[PDB]
């Protein structure tokens, strides 16, 4: 089988800067599956951050951590099959790295469980400097 | 929460040769969960590598994928909440990012499905030259 996400982006920003990681989908997992993300901070287990509802074309639900509301948004582009992670007025206590997410016995956003994730893409890591 | 799987080793190797990845996981989850090792080759999803469960006494039961059979050794030290796979015979085709896995819900080493995976280890590279 091949590797059903791929993430892009990262890097070092400062705090107050912004940042829009990407994920690309399997046709198949695109429209299948919750997508979303995950972040994973220095010796902390990792944590839901975002979540989109399964095959997001035209009209979608998204959910969000309440430590991330509002500044973080989650999107998606159907015609590439990818998913976007946008990180506005980031803090040093989001430095992490981040994980996208798809749970295919999920269908509308909502918060995905560590353990429910069915696959991964390889985590990237983002650092906002104080 | 603290994170739960923290692993070790990784790096470029030549063909024959050996190489040892290790894992240490918080007491609870070691004592709770089976533990494994998956990896994931360029542009493939992860696939199942070993597994290993505590028995009663010292013992373990350890269960290993077609592909690895004879040449990878895997092994867990109670004392150090730790578990360890010992590669040997190492081709290039062993080129991959290698990663931990705990199963909490099974209770004997057997075939592990990535998505019946509670947590993992953050990826690490193992690159096997001609």
């Known amino acids: 089988m091949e590797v059903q996400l791929v993430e892009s982006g990262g890097g070092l920003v400062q705090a107050g800067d912004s940042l829009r990681l990407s994920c690309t989908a399997s046709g198949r997992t695109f429209s299948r599956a919750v997508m979303g993300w995950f972040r994973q901070a220095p010796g902390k287990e990792r944590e839901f951050?975002?979540?989109?509802?399964?095959?997001?074309?035209?009209?979608?639900?998204?959910?969000?951590?309440d430590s991330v509301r509002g500044r973080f948004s989650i999107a998606a582009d159907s015609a590439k099959n990818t998913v976007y992670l946008q990180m506005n007025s980031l803090k040093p206590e989001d430095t992490a790295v981040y994980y996208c997410a798809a749970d295919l016995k999920m269908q509308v956003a909502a918060y995905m469980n560590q353990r429910s994730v069915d696959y991964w893409g390889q985590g990237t890591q983002v650092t906002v400097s104080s | 929460m603290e994170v739960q799987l923290v692993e070790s080793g990784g790096g470029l190797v030549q063909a024959g040769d050996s190489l040892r990845l290790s894992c240490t996981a918080s007491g609870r989850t070691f004592s709770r969960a089976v533990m494994g090792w998956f990896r994931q080759a360029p542009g493939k999803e992860r696939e199942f590598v070993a597994a290993?469960?505590?028995?009663?006494?010292?013992?373990?039961?350890?269960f290993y994928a077609d592909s690895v059979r004879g040449r990878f050794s895997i092994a867990a030290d109670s004392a150090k909440n730790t578990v360890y796979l010992q590669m040997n015979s190492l081709k290039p085709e062993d080129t991959a990012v290698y990663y931990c896995a705990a199963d909490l819900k099974m209770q004997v080493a057997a075939y592990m499905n990535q998505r019946s995976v509670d947590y993992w280890g953050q990826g690490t590279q193992v690159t096997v030259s001609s």
């Open positions: 290993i469960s505590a028995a009663p006494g010292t013992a373990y039961y350890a």
